[PDB]
Design a protein around this nucleic acid. Structure first.
Lengths: 186, 278, 99, 247
DNA sequence: GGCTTTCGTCAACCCTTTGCTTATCTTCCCT
DNA sequence: AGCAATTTAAATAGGGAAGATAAGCAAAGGGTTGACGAAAGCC
RNA sequence: CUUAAAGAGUCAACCCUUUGCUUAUCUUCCCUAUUUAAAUGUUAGCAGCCGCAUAGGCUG
């Protein structure tokens, strides 16, 4: 920690060319931190899309003009061609930010539904998202055991279409690193 | 510490603790109202930032003071905090490594004697001596430690880093915490398909990997909501001990997440420490 | 005398009406003992000359308690009129004098 | 990867409590291993191990003497003596509510496995006792060790048998370390040359003296490893736990 | 030639008076 | 036709008496639960 | 195919009687419950008289 892991992940993604990735992170605030790093280093909202699907009421006080912080939800971005095959032209704000994002800095639960769902059509949007985009999962050790199982299911599904999985965990256990490699290998 | 009532027990003991030290106590668990919780976060991030000396102005560093933050595993995940020292209630070894990462995270000065004091037992030993590390840990009913003494299951003096988690040991998992951790990790995330496993094949066709392997599997979790100072369910606001509280932010809106088990009794929300059993 | 009563001072309320104990009165009847050693004021007739308030027993440790004078009289030691009157006063006070 | 079927609250009465000459009480693990191989024969589901626990168990009699059984005149040729009371050979009787958990390997649905075990148990006989009642058996699987403990805790409430081993002999340690002795198997003495008076004429027969191991009763949830409660036929003409000696 | 009935044959104690174990419970997290 | 306000503190202490006794009877039963060996009619 | 296989414990009852737990007790001292304030919400749905009306209108 403290060495700039997420910046190194973006560097590794950009080494192969232009970036198309889903930064799936635990917690809302860690996604906010990675979004703020992406904003102040080089990434605008035409490429980045911070997705936290709860609409929290945590606002910044003191000075709105002198903030230079509090990464928000606008996504000027670019609507992908996949929105025409989704129901009713995808959706409003949230699913447009999901599907059409080049870089999707999101909470992870908007990506683990790609592996499948019980009832409804909630699988298709993260499925089609992870089909054409890379997957970057940071500090996977903080998740639960079943959470890590479904995250490696997501890694297997992402590798099923040739995309690249970046795992960023310092305290990795050989077991975890191995089963994530075996999911990527399958 | 491990859980919320454990945190308020450590807080209520330390507040009533007579000493010459100027203890200033904070509670940092997850059961808090929208406003109060967010306020704790921003304050803690701006006082524990030790890459510069900007914090000297967010706390009273003029007077010798012990600024103590009693927290649950919400501090060891995703927090850019830098404490001078930590006292850890043992639940898992990755908790030890992460709370080591909350001490001297921003500085580079080496400690001289000892900067982490690990407790002898988790507090669930006095409540359940059969199993005590299952809360926020990989101990469970199928993987039981033979002894719960941390002299038996951990090194008495140890340089805590990622090395013990990085190495990986499957032998002697019943009397060491690290090998207990590694055992569970290879016995649940295995190269099989099972039904709740990771290579799942044949079952993707079925609804089984989405029912028996539930993402964010938590307890029932109902949400008692504070509406403008007036609580919804069986909450009953209370008064904290006002002995050593350094900072206490008030809250009026927001919601608290209470497990259905603790819904039976009053969660007794308080401005200083959120939920407990009283 | 009260303990767990959530009330600091009770009063003897015979059917609500304020009253004082019979033992309070009967102690004040037998406050006639002016025949102990440092005899300045009458004290209550007790086998030891004992008072709860002053924390001292005026007839203890100096061979003028009721038990030694009772043993003496019984045996044959002529009790002085004041000692005799003290022993008689403790007898009409009452109490177990065995052991 | 392990599969189990549990029959909970198996109320059985008329149990032949005479486990051996020196043990009277709970039937040993040879009895329940014999019950397991009995279903391996009638139902065809081949059983590796059985973990059995005692919910309730009372030996019929007083605290120092068992209630003997009034024998019936059933031998041939002793008519004329039939009016008098038949002589009593020692066979104590007992009642017991048990919980059984059979390690099976099955390849069909759980409903036909439950039906096969139910059809066996309806014609079974625990330790010579008629099965008075039993709950509907349920199938649970032990994929991992936490799942093994799930099966373990599904036998609640019952006191399972854990093996604690023989140090010197049976009487000494039963007084000293206070553990219970039971038949873990038998010792073969002589080959039997007369197969005329036996169940089969082709199955080889031996006179046997019961070997015993020393065991303890622990509640199934307080048992750390479920393999230390699953008894199975060992290859020493004995039975043994999968987890070995309980420590 | 067994075979089945009934009658005769051979014995002799030092006892003690409940526990065995003791039941399958919530931290993160975001939706 | 619902609205009923907030904090703050709930007493320190001294005592809970010893001396006596706590029955003596008389009962508490046995009745069946025997297998080999040996005469001795009997197919 | 489980020390497998098998087995009726039956019966009967008089616990009696007797009794002295008495004795004497000082609870007691102490003291600030203090300070506020719109009841608003139309706050009333009436009295006659024009009429067959308990339909509908008028009068203040």
């Amino acid at each position: 920690t403290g060495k700039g892991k997420t910046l190194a992940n973006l560097k590794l993604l950009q080494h192969f060319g232009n970036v198309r990735c889903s930064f799936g992170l635990g917690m809302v605030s860690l996604t906010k931190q990675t979004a703020k790093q992406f904003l102040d280093m080089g990434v605008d909202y035409n490429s980045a899309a911070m997705v936290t699907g709860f609409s929290k009421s945590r606002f910044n006080l003191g000075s709105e003009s002198l903030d230079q912080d509090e990464v928000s939800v606008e996504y000027w971005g670019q609507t992908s061609s996949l929105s025409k095959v989704f129901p009713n032209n995808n959706a409003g704000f949230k699913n447009k930010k999901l599907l059409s994002a080049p870089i999707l800095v999101t909470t992870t639960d908007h990506l683990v539904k790609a592996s499948g769902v019980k009832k409804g059509n909630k699988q298709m949007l993260p499925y089609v998202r992870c089909m054409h985009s890379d997957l970057v999962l940071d500090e996977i050790d903080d998740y639960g055991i079943e959470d890590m199982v479904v995250l490696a299911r997501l890694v297997y599904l992402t590798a099923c279409y040739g995309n690249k999985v970046i795992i960023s965990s310092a305290t990795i256990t050989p077991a975890i690193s191995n089963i994530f490699y075996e999911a990527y290998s399958s | 510490t491990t859980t919320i009532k454990d945190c308020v027990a450590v807080t209520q003991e330390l507040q009533n603790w007579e000493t010459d030290l100027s203890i200033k106590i904070l509670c940092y668990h997850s059961r808090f109202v929208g406003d109060t919780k967010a306020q704790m976060e921003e304050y803690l991030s701006k006082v524990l930032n030790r890459k510069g000396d900007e914090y000297k102005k967010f706390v009273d560093t003029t007077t010798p003071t012990a600024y103590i933050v009693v927290a649950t595993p919400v501090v060891e995940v995703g927090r850019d905090f830098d404490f001078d020292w930590a006292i850890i209630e043992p639940s898992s070894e990755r908790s030890i490594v992460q709370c080591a990462g909350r001490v001297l995270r921003h500085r580079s000065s080496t400690p001289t004697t000892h900067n982490i004091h690990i407790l002898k037992y988790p507090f669930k030993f006095y409540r359940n001596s059969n199993i005590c590390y299952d809360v926020a840990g990989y101990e469970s009913k199928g993987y039981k430690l033979k002894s719960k003494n941390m002299l038996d299951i951990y090194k008495k003096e140890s340089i805590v880093n990622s090395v013990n988690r990085l190495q990986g040991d499957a032998a002697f998992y019943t009397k060491s915490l690290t090998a207990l951790e590694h055992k569970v990790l290879l016995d649940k995330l295995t190269t099989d398909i099972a039904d709740t496993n990771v290579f799942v094949g044949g079952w993707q066709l079925t609804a089984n990997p989405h029912e028996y392997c539930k993402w964010r599997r938590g307890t029932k979790n109902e949400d008692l909501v504070l509406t403008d100072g007036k609580w919804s369910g069986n909450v009953t606001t209370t008064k904290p001990i006002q002995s050593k509280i350094w900072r206490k932010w008030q809250g009026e809106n927001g919601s608290i997440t209470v497990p259905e088990y603790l819904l039976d009794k009053t969660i007794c929300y308080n401005d200083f420490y959120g939920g407990y059993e009283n | 005398f009260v303990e767990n009563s959530k009330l600091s001072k009770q009063l003897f309320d015979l059917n609500g009406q304020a009253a004082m104990h019979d033992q309070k009165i009967g102690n004040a009847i037998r406050t006639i003992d002016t025949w102990y050693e440092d005899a300045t004021t009458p004290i209550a007739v007790e086998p030891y000359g004992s008072v709860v308030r002053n924390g001292v027993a005026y007839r203890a440790g100096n061979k003028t308690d009721l038990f030694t004078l009772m043993d003496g009289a019984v045996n044959g030691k002529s009790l002085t009129e004041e000692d005799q009157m003290f022993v008689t006063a403790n007898l009409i006070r009452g109490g177990v004098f065995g052991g | 990867m392990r599969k189990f079927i549990i029959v909970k609250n198996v109320k059985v009465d008329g149990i032949n409590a005479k486990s051996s000459d020196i043990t009277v009480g709970m039937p040993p693990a040879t009895t329940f291993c014999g019950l397991g191989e009995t279903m391996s024969i009638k139902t065809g589901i081949v059983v590796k191990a059985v973990s059995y626990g005692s919910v309730k168990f009372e030996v019929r009699g007083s605290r120092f003497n068992t209630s003997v059984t009034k024998f019936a005149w059933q031998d041939r040729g002793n008519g004329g003596k039939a009016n008098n009371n038949s002589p009593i050979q020692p066979k104590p009787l007992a009642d017991g509510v048990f919980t059984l958990c059979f390690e099976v390997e099955w390849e069909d649905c759980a409903e036909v496995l439950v039906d096969k075990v139910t059809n066996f148990i309806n014609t079974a006989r625990i330790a010579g006792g008629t099965i008075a009642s039993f709950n509907k058996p349920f199938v649970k699987v032990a994929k991992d060790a936490e799942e093994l403990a799930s099966v373990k805790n599904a036998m609640m409430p019952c006191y399972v048998v854990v093996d604690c081993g023989v140090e010197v002999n049976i009487f000494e340690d039963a007084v000293n370390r206070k553990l219970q002795p039971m038949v873990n198997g038998y010792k073969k003495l002589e080959k039997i040359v007369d197969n005329k008076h036996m169940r089969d004429k082709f199955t080889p027969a031996y006179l046997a003296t019961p070997t015993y191991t020393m065991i303890g009763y622990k509640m199934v949830s307080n048992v750390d490893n479920f393999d230390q409660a699953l008894w199975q036929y060992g290859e020493n003409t004995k039975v043994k736990t999968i987890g070995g000696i309980y420590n």
